[PDB]
Write an enzyme that holds these catalytic residues in place. Structure first.
Site, PDB file in Angstrom:
ATOM      1  N   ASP A   1       0.850  -1.177   0.000  1.00 49.51           N
ATOM      2  CA  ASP A   1       0.000   0.000   0.000  1.00 49.51           C
ATOM      3  C   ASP A   1       0.891   1.234   0.000  1.00 49.51           C
ATOM      4  O   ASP A   1       1.873   1.272  -0.744  1.00 49.51           O
ATOM      5  CB  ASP A   1      -0.937  -0.031   1.213  1.00 49.51           C
ATOM      6  CG  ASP A   1      -2.219   0.749   0.974  1.00 49.51           C
ATOM      7  OD1 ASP A   1      -3.217   0.135   0.535  1.00 49.51           O
ATOM      8  OD2 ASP A   1      -2.220   1.979   1.198  1.00 49.51           O
TER       9      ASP A   1
ATOM     10  N   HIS B   1      -3.183   5.681   4.194  1.00 44.10           N
ATOM     11  CA  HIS B   1      -3.989   4.533   3.794  1.00 44.10           C
ATOM     12  C   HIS B   1      -3.340   3.225   4.217  1.00 44.10           C
ATOM     13  O   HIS B   1      -4.004   2.330   4.754  1.00 44.10           O
ATOM     14  CB  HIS B   1      -4.184   4.552   2.289  1.00 44.10           C
ATOM     15  CG  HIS B   1      -5.528   4.083   1.862  1.00 44.10           C
ATOM     16  ND1 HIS B   1      -5.832   2.751   1.706  1.00 44.10           N
ATOM     17  CD2 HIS B   1      -6.657   4.770   1.578  1.00 44.10           C
ATOM     18  CE1 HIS B   1      -7.091   2.643   1.323  1.00 44.10           C
ATOM     19  NE2 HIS B   1      -7.614   3.850   1.243  1.00 44.10           N
TER      20      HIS B   1
ATOM     21  N   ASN C   1     -13.868  -0.114  -5.624  1.00 43.46           N
ATOM     22  CA  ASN C   1     -14.970   0.717  -5.157  1.00 43.46           C
ATOM     23  C   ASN C   1     -15.723   1.372  -6.307  1.00 43.46           C
ATOM     24  O   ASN C   1     -16.136   2.526  -6.214  1.00 43.46           O
ATOM     25  CB  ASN C   1     -14.478   1.785  -4.185  1.00 43.46           C
ATOM     26  CG  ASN C   1     -13.542   1.230  -3.138  1.00 43.46           C
ATOM     27  OD1 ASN C   1     -13.774   0.153  -2.587  1.00 43.46           O
ATOM     28  ND2 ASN C   1     -12.468   1.958  -2.864  1.00 43.46           N
TER      29      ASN C   1
ATOM     30  N   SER D   1     -10.987  -1.443  -0.063  1.00 42.47           N
ATOM     31  CA  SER D   1      -9.643  -1.398   0.456  1.00 42.47           C
ATOM     32  C   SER D   1      -9.624  -1.584   1.971  1.00 42.47           C
ATOM     33  O   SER D   1      -8.634  -2.074   2.512  1.00 42.47           O
ATOM     34  CB  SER D   1      -9.007  -0.076   0.075  1.00 42.47           C
ATOM     35  OG  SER D   1      -8.010   0.209   1.018  1.00 42.47           O
TER      36      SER D   1
HETATM   37 CA   LIG Z   1      -7.585   0.914   5.670  1.00 41.63          CA
END
Ligand SMILES: [Ca+2]
Ligand SMILES: [Ca+2]
Length: 279
Positions: free
Chosen positions: A39, A69, A161, A224
């Protein structure tokens, strides 16, 4: 173990019913497993990681998570308060820059990195990779995820998403990894969650409270965010010996809460990740 007033997602993954607030889990808590969080990096200094998080790889000038994130998803994997597997080892692979973006080639390199780097780590209970990223279809990104899975890592990936069929997204569409859709605390499919036959499991994805950079916490939404729930769950289950990297997605689907989510399109699995923990 019982974590009272837990994030709803944690309480949900240990519950046959929505709307409870205690997370129940075996105290082994993913000890001896490792989860790579591929990530934006991990703020390993966050006290929620208790020294169990480290950066092992970056493709940028810094391994620091300047985005949050990756810190958030690592927290859902394994932070003490917000994590599923509260004792797993978190390994940060910063394939995404601090804007959350990353070239496919860098993403592919990071997946290949994990597939080899696990041989440099002590993960006797198994290895998980949480991929909370996603782009359009890419055979080579899919193939990278499939190699990572093939190397003996349980690969969890976000379905995406786009409220669309995840067949058109990668590595969501790679059939051999665990493609995770998102649900909300009322057991609805998250409005943004991708769907379709490639989905293997749903996890909590709306309003997921977890760690954030600057030693803070934040609640955000996305498949996510569902992905680290399943990744953390796989690490937890592998530590319990209930499954292996190769079989974990199948096991999690086999043992999921079934038929409980609403607004699952026809053809998509109606399966909610469930740790089957009997306190
Ligand atoms: Ca997260
Ligand atoms: Ca799959």
């Amino acid at each position: 173990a019982a974590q009272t007033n837990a994030p709803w997602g944690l309480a949900r993954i240990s519950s046959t019913s929505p709307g409870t607030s205690t997370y129940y889990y075996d105290e082994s808590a993913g000890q001896g497993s490792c989860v790579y969080v591929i990530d934006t990096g991990i703020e390993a200094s966050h006290p929620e990681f208790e020294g169990r998080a480290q950066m092992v790889k970056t493709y940028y000038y810094s391994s620091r998570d300047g985005n949050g994130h990756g810190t958030h998803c690592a927290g859902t994997v394994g932070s003490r308060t917000y994590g599923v597997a509260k004792k797993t080892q978190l390994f940060g692979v910063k394939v995404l820059d601090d804007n959350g973006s990353g070239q496919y080639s860098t993403i592919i390199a990071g997946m290949d990195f994990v597939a080899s780097d696990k041989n440099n780590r002590n993960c006797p209970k198994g290895v998980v990779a949480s991929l909370s990223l996603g782009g359009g279809y890419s055979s080579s990104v899919n193939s990278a995820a499939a190699r990572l899975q093939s190397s003996g890592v349980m690969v969890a990936v976000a379905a995406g998403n786009n409220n669309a069929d995840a067949r058109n997204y990668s590595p969501a569409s790679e059939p051999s990894v665990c493609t995770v859709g998102a649900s909300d605390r009322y057991d609805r499919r998250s409005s943004f969650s991708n769907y379709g036959s490639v989905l293997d499991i749903f996890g909590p994805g709306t309003d997921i409270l977890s760690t954030w950079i600057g030693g803070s916490t934040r609640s955000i939404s996305g498949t996510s965010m569902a992905t680290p729930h399943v990744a953390g769950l796989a690490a937890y289950l592998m530590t319990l010996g209930k499954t292996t990297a190769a079989s974990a997605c199948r096991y999690i689907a086999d043992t999921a809460n079934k038929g409980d989510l609403s607004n699952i399109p026809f053809g998509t699995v109606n399966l909610l990740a469930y740790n089957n923990y009997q306190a």
